[PDB]
């Protein structure tokens, strides 16, 4: 996260760290959507141009964390993967369309003050909150700058950007399964997601029921916090049918 701030304790209790077993380092962010399911970006797990292809046994999930590098004894929970599900139309070849994957945990995680699931949007919440200018929140342990790494979880609030501005900011083909967020040069303020923030949540607090909903997943961008460029997020509600099918079929 670039130009963000340190998170408060328990501010993002759905935040998940996907952690490489060997060598032990940060892989990506992710989110807790129930006591046994974690949502992340597909590219975190599979991305053939970079020879990236992780299997279940390659990884651990760390939940309830604040510190990036520390083992937070009596606070974090560390979980094993039962199974990974990648969207079958995930487009790694061209533009990261449908950049989403589910992970099932070997055992349910115990909720606590620091560990708690985020909501997934319904059609009406999505319609009312995914509007240009409305701000969401992105969190993660990734780089603080494009060209280092934070001591604790970072947070930044960013406005959703109009689809024409999103499209005109890049040569990449943008799809209905993505949205972009960030400030304009003219707006002054700045901030962005960056490498290592991948697969973490873009959340918004519904003013209707005061609950936090995950509307996006950190997916891609060109550089980090560049003027005239915007971060791109997987549109969670647009892929919700695949999400429900997986969880229903695989419980």
């Amino acid at each position: 996260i670039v130009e963000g701030s340190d998170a408060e304790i328990g501010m993002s209790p759905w935040q998940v760290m996907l952690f490489r077993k060997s060598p032990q380092e940060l892989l990506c962010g992710a989110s807790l959507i129930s006591d046994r399911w974690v949502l992340t970006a597909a590219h975190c797990l599979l991305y053939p141009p970079w020879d990236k292809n992780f299997t279940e046994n390659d990884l651990l999930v760390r939940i309830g964390k604040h510190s990036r590098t520390r083992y937070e004894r009596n606070i974090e929970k560390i979980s094993m993967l039962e199974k990974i599900y990648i969207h079958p139309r995930y487009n790694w070849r061209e533009n990261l369309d449908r950049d989403i994957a589910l992970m099932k945990l070997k055992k349910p995680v115990a909720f606590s003050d620091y560990i708690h699931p985020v909501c997934l949007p319904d059609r009406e919440t999505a319609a009312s909150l995914l509007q240009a200018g409305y701000k969401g929140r992105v969190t993660g342990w990734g780089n603080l700058k494009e060209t280092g790494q934070p001591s604790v979880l970072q947070v930044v609030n960013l406005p959703i950007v109009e689809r024409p501005v999103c499209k005109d900011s890049t040569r990449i083909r943008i799809t209905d399964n993505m949205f972009c967020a960030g400030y304009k040069p003219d707006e002054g303020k700045r901030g962005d997601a960056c490498e290592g923030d991948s697969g973490g949540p873009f959340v918004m607090k519904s003013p209707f029921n005061n609950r936090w909903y995950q509307m996006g997943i950190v997916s891609w961008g060109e550089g980090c916090d560049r003027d005239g460029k915007y971060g791109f997020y997987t549109h969670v509600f647009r892929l919700k049918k695949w999400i429900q099918k997986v969880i229903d079929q695989f419980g």
Partner: peptide, 10 residues
């Protein structure tokens, strides 16, 4: 790593 070692159990 820059990372603290996790309990061997995991």
């Amino acid at each position: 790593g820059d990372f603290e070692e996790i309990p061997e159990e995991y």
